[PDB]
């Protein structure tokens, strides 16, 4: 998630893993899925 000049950008990537510990060693990339012209002058967040 980025938020630059009102345009808030969301990249992502959904990928199969088999580990229960933490982020797995390897490489893959995240492709832009949404931009929004939100124009909100932002600071923080919280997950649901």
């Amino acid at each position: 998630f980025k938020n630059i000049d009102g345009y808030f950008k969301i990249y992502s990537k959904h990928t199969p893993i088999n580990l229960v510990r933490d982020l797995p060693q390897g490489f893959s990339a995240l492709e832009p899925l949404v931009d929004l012209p939100i124009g909100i002058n932002i600071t923080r967040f919280q997950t649901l």
Binding site: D5, G6, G39, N41
Partner: peptide
């Protein structure tokens, strides 16, 4: 683009105090 709206808007309901930012609070 801008034009003269005296004959369309003039009659006290147009207030005023990062680029492209709107600050609505007061």
């Amino acid at each position: 683009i801008a034009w003269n709206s005296n004959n369309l808007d003039s009659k006290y309901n147009y207030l005023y105090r990062k680029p492209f930012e709107r600050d609505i609070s007061t």
